[PDB]
Structure formats: structure tokens, C-alpha cells
Design a protein around this ligand. Structure first.
Ligand SMILES: Cc1ncc(COP(=O)(O)O)c(/C=N/CCCC[C@H](N)C(=O)O)c1O
Ligand SMILES: Cc1ncc(COP(=O)(O)O)c(CN)c1O
Lengths: 416, 420
């Protein structure tokens, strides 16, 4: 009846409940990079619990640090005071992140880390003495507007040409309006929910140049892409960018608990530092900010990154997956395949010559994902882009098994 | 070392770090209703860690459930599927919630639980045919748009509650008469304005807000984040007027204070409007990644199981009788303007003179200077400007309360007296 009960009471995030009612799924537990439902059936975790599960479920040394931190204290506040593991994690996060990012402002979630970034950005200009700086630049498809080098559906198909066109179009937009912009928000290297659109080489760097040149702050959303995943600690390493502000989460705790961070340059911190009377204080916060348990599990997740060398591991297991996922090209209705590190997606198309998309009512992304659930694998389709973002743990043979279960399930339905 | 560290790397919420640098503080541990800083010192947690903590620090039962749960699975997603604790907790949450509220949408914070409610309420009307329904009504100074007045008795002409009560209810009617077809929802704290300064509403203010909201087809958003799960003397504060909100937000107390879990509650009417085939674009495109954490739901399950066992709710009701008398002492101080309380939510409002009702000026920092004095005396609290906010754990005993209130009297006395 737990199934029956999940229909009566819940209301699930980013899902249409009529499709859940027709196909229920309730997990009980999980081990390694797998999970088990309540009428015991086991799956892979192809979407690593939506882009946050680093070393699998039941990982020993994370289960360890939570238990330990229950030994001391589970939650005390960061409002006006602080606590030990937040204080320690902060130090670790300053060292493992771009050098210009000196500060750290915690919150419960990715979206909260970005809203926080926007609010610092807006409030920084207001503090220093340039209130004109209000407007923002969203990057088209960004989960004013500026376009992102989406080269597969471009005019020339050429990365460098698409890139430089997107840079130029941004540059024109900055040329004309910069003296009223405050900040620019961009996902670090890969637009996630937009279909896993990898940015071509030199894009991010161009944005950084143009932001510096034009006195707009660069905000870099590293929530999906951070903590391994891209085959670096943070995806903005791939071009040596220092964001002015950067939002992080998901894989900060190993997958276990909800913590997020907003990193901030010291120049930015300084703008909010002054006597209380002036109302310069950044007035933002949440009540479970600096959770001891979250900070403790994240500290040991951050230790594992350094000891078990999980980042460098990922960069070698990717190469394997470069060719092993180029094997998807063989299938007829799989018009493009993208990756950066473990961050992977296969865009489905009706015609390879025309790259024509399927209709969205033909439901092909979702219909595929149900057939993986048939064959013991879990993912989420972004439209008709099937996502493949598996645990960083996941060994090169599982990396290989999933990709076939994926490929098998695509072909089974994409023939229809 | 940690002190020097905290000062060089952290950016803390709702705090001038310049202040944190004259007066830093780093908790290491806690035991029942006490916390222990790094230099050994002990404090009463007289703000329940900002209105979260219910049973005490290091409570075995809650300690146990997280370990229990840990050896199943720490986190599996609610995007498109579910998990066992969330599905159980929800059943539970439905029984203790009001009747009309039969869905549970989950999230990581109170702020988020409100944010979801606004989007649900906003989008609700789009999905049914009335998209012109789109503006909200915010109750003035409402920490969670036409602003609508809310009865603050102490500084109200009347001095009489019901006159301040009914006067505000009408002003909301004059708003609702001439603007209701544009209005999606109304947003209101359940029984007490927290951040505003622990301002308690007259009985049947919230009743009257709810009967008007029905008469004009506006949705009633009830924020129970600060006032939920015991704090007022009921499991939910709106029970003080039997009230049936269309959307209710919760967080905080829900996990006894251990983890972050928060919930938006919805009526089955609302939920209905998002039920369809995907084609129709009826869906609610929202919901964070750590939605339905096993560890937070597990800790919450147990927290509520304790609520059920010990009878924490009637216990607070019991102990609040004591608390009111215990707070009577505070009114004997020259500068304590006024003492507001419902359940464990109390506020002593400070003033230059308790005859003019004239507050102190903002730069003199009378709330902050007292909060520090309390720290010095071994108590943690956070002011709401010159409103000083006592909110002790719901496990707090009769004598702990007397000691916390004593420290508070000592503190307010010593700082107000000195400003002369
Ligand atoms: C009705 C209500 N909703 C939401 C929140 C915050 O929910 P969260 O985002 O943490 O999940 C609070 C206060 N929450 C505590 C915040 C501190 C209050 C005040 N700024 C102060 O300085 O004490 C609240 O009173
Ligand atoms: C770029 C970005 N930012 C924020 C989020 C959401 O994070 P949260 O659910 O914790 O807000 C996502 C989800 N993948 C994302 O891709």
C-alpha cells in the first residue's frame, strides 16, 4: 500500500503526477552505484541521484562522519555566530577552489546559492556607489539575453565560428548596455538541463575577458558541474577562469545531505564590511545554514577527493567513455552525443541528414527513460536529450554496462 | 586558530561581520538545551537555534533514526519517483495537518516552502482559466503586491485589541472589494508576526482573514515555518482559530532541529489543477534536487513519533502557563514596554520610557547590547531590533525556563539602566 499511499499524499518536484500514477517507483535502499525498490528490484543510477551522488550509496566514510558529528552536535546556527565544521569546511573550500575566491556563504540549495549570488552582485554595486548597475544578463537557455555556442544546431557547424559569433553578440550587447548591468550568470562550461550543451573551447574565457573589460560581475553556476563530474574540481579550471562569484552544491556532500555555497572575491566581501549603522550588511540567510552534519559529511567527502584522488580517476575513466559512448553514433536515431568528464548526453533526432527533432508530444525522451527502468537503469531525459551523469565512483566496466543498457533501450523504442 | 579562521574565510548570514569580529563565537557541542563554545563556555539555547530545536541537542532517539536510516540509503531523488521515509512522513504529515491539506510538496528550507506556495497559488489560476488572478497580498512587515495592514495593539491608537482587530479586517475588505479579480493569494504568518517583532494577533483576526479570503476567491497562504510543530502550544498555530489554509508552509521544528526539511502543504483542489497528460503543460515546474532526503525525513518521522509519545504539544501548553507568570517579573523593569507570548514564542519590547511607549533610537542598539550581555551571562538569543525574542526548546523544563528568564531580566536590567 506504500505505492497506493505515494499516490494519495505526495506531490513530486518537476513531475506530472499522472505519469507517476501510471508508473510508480519507491526506493528502499541502495549500495555501490545501485538502488533497490520496495518490491525488491535493482537499478543503476545513471543520473547519480540528479547530478550529486559522487561515491555511491552507503559509502563508508560519509556514513562515518555523520555518526561522529552526531557525537558532538547536529545543528547550531550561523546567524551571528558560527560552529566548528562549517568553519573548517570553509577553509578547505577556499583552498580547493579558484584562488580569487576567498569567502564562503552557505545555504541549503543550488537555487539558494544562485539567488544569493544575484543578491550580492546587485547589492555590491549599490554599496560601492553605482546603483545604475541593476540589470542582469541571463545566458539563453540559462538554467537581457545572450546566446550560447550551440554548434550542433548552428549555421556553420564550426565550434570556433559559432563561439566567436556568440562572443561577438555578447560583446555587442555589453558594448551598448554595460553601464546599467550588475552581473552575468552562466553555467560553468555545460548547460545542464538545456540538453547537456558543452561549451566550446575558449567560450568561458571570452566571457571572463568581456566581463572584466566591461565591469559586469561574472557569476558562475557550478552546481551541476562542480566537485568532479567535469573531470576537474570545478569546470572553470578547463579555462583558468576566476569567477567573481560562484555557486556550488550537489556533490559537495557526496550526495548525502543538502548544503550549498556561494564563493566570493575579497573585493566583493569588503563592500559589505563597515559599521552596522550604514545598512551595508548583506541581509540574507536561512536557518539551517552551516549545518554541522552537512559540513561534517562534506569535510570527509572533501578528504576522499584528496586521498582516493577521485578527480584524476574521472579524467582517465572519461577517455574510455569517449570512444565507448562514440559507439552510440551507430544507432540510427541518435543525432548527437556530447560529454565533458562524466557530464554526458545523447540528443535524439528523427533524421541524421536533417537533424530534425522528434515532436515533443511523441514523448521520446520520457519513453526511452521508461525502457531503461524496464532493463535496470535510472536516468532523466531533458526533452529528447537523454542525460548520462553517473557516479564518479562507477568503475570502467559499469561505465561500459550502463551505456549498453542505455543504447539497447534507445534502439528498442527508437525503432518505433 | 578556528577564531582567526572563522574571521578570514566565512561570510555569515544576516550579520555584519565587523560585529562578528569584535565578538566571535564558535559552537563545538551541545547537550539537551545547552551549547558549549570552543573555549569551553556554556549557554542556554534561548532561541532554540533560531526556532528549530524542539527536544534538545544530542537526543539519542533522533541520533538513532539517522544512523538507522544511514545503513539503508542517505539520499535518493524525488524527481519522478519517491522513497520510503518521504512516503511515510507524508501520511503522518497529512494526519497532523488540517483537514483540507492532503498534499505534501517537499523542499530544503522555509523560504523555499513559501516560494513554492506562491508559485502553486500563482500557477493555480493559470491552469483553471483565470490568469488575471496574479497579484498577492502581503501582510505589512510580513517576513516570508498590495500591502495590507495587520493589527499591532501596543502601538495602536485603540490600546483596545478588538478595535485594532476589526479595523484591519475592514481595510482588507476595502482592498479585496476594489481589487479581488487581480488577486491570486494572500500571504500571512500563522498567529504571530515573528521577524516584525513577535507581534501576536488578536483572536479571530486570522479567523476573519480566512472568511474574507473565501468570500472573494483569493487563496490563503499560511506561513507556519516559525510557528509550526509545537511552538505556539499547538502542532500548528492556525488551530488556535480552527483555520483551513489553502496552502501551508512548514520547516524548522519538523526535524526537531537536526536537519533541513521543509514542506508546502496543498489542498486537493490545488493539486487537481496540475493533474493531466503532459501535452497540456499542466505540470508544476519546480522542486529542488535534495527534495525528499531520507535522513531528514527519517529524523522528522521520529521527531513526530516523539511528539506523539511524550505529548510535547500539551506539555508546551502546560509549561506555557508557567512561562507567562515567569515572564511577569520582566514587566517590573523600568524600560520593558511590553511582553508578548503565545506558547514558547515570547518577546519583551524595550523602550526609552514605558509611559510614552517611545522606543530607543536605532543607532543606540539596545537589542544587540542585551543579546551580548545574555551571552556573557550564559544565554543565547537574537533580538528583533529592540524586541528581545525568547524562544526556548520545547523540551525545556520548568526550572530551565526560570533560569533563562532570570538571565534575561538580569541582562535587560543591566543595559537599559546603563544607557542613563
Ligand atoms: C515566517 C518565517 N518564514 C521563513 C523563515 C526563514 O526560513 P528559512 O529560509 O531559514 O528556511 C523565518 C525565519 N527564519 C529565521 C531567519 C532569521 C530571522 C531574522 N532574519 C532574524 O534576524 O532573526 C520566518 O519567521
Ligand atoms: C545550473 C543549476 N543551478 C541550480 C540547480 C538546482 O539546484 P537546487 O535544486 O539545489 O536548487 C540545478 C539543477 N541541476 C542546475 O543545473
Amino acid at each position: 500500500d506504500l505505492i497506493e499511499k505515494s499516490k494519495k499524499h505526495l506531490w513530486l518536484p518537476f513531475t506530472q503526477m499522472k505519469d507517476y500514477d501510471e508508473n510508480p517507483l519507491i526506493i528502499e535502499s541502495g549500495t555501490g552505484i545501485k538502488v533497490k525498490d520496495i518490491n525488491g528490484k535493482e537499478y543503476y543510477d545513471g543520473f547519480s541521484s540528479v547530478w550529486l551522488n559522487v561515491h555511491g550509496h552507503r559509502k563508508k566514510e560519509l556514513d562515518d562522519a555523520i555518526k561522529k558529528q552526531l557525537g558532538k552536535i547536529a545543528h547550531s546556527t550561523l546567524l551571528g555566530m558560527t560552529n566548528v565544521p562549517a568553519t573548517q569546511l570553509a577553509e578547505t573550500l577556499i583552498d580547493i577552489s579558484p584562488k580569487k575566491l576567498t569567502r564562503v556563504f552557505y545555504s541549503d540549495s543550488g537555487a539558494e546559492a544562485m539567488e544569493i549570488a544575484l543578491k550580492m552582485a546587485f547589492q555590491y554595486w549599490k554599496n560601492i556607489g553605482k546603483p545604475e548597475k541593476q540589470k542582469f544578463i541571463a545566458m539563453k537557455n540559462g538554467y537581457y539575453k545572450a546566446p550560447i555556442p550551440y554548434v550542433y544546431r548552428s549555421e556553420s557547424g564550426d565550434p570556433d565560428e559559432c563561439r566567436d559569433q556568440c562572443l561577438r553578440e555578447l560583446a555587442q550587447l555589453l558594448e551598448e548596455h554595460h553601464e546599467e548591468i550588475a552581473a552575468l550568470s552562466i553555467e560553468s562550461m555545460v548547460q545542464g538541463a538545456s540538453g547537456m550543451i558543452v561549451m566550446p573551447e575558449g567560450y568561458l574565457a571570452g566571457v571572463r575577458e568581456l566581463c572584466t573589460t566591461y565591469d559586469v560581475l561574472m557569476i558562475v553556476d557550478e552546481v551541476a558541474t562542480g566537485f568532479g563530474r567535469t573531470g576537474k574540481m570545478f569546470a572553470c579550471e578547463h579555462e583558468n577562469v576566476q569567477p567573481d562569484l560562484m555557486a556550488a552544491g550537489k556533490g559537495i556532500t557526496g550526495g548525502y545531505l543538502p548544503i550549498a555555497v556561494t564563493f566570493a572575491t575579497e573585493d566583493i566581501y569588503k563592500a559589505f564590511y563597515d559599521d552596522y549603522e550604514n545598512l551595508k550588511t548583506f541581509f540574507h540567510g536561512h536557518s539551517y545554514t552551516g549545518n554541522q552534519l552537512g559540513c561534517a559529511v562534506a569535510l570527509e567527502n572533501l578528504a576522499l577527493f584528496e586521498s582516493e584522488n577521485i578527480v584524476e580517476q574521472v579524467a582517465e575513466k572519461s577517455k574510455k567513455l569517449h570512444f565507448l559512448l562514440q559507439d552510440l553514433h551507430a544507432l540510427p536515431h541518435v543525432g548527437d552525443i556530447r560529454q565533458l568528464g562524466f557530464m554526458c548526453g545523447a540528443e535524439l533526432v528523427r533524421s541524421k541528414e536533417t537533424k530534425e527533432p522528434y515532436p515533443a508530444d511523441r514523448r521520446i525522451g520520457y519513453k526511452v527513460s521508461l525502457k531503461m527502468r524496464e532493463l535496470g537503469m535510472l536516468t532523466r531525459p531533458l526533452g529528447d536529450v537523454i542525460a548520462f551523469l553517473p557516479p564518479l565512483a562507477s568503475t570502467a566496466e559499469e561505465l561500459s554496462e550502463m551505456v549498453a543498457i542505455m543504447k539497447q533501450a534507445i534502439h528498442e523504442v527508437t525503432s518505433l
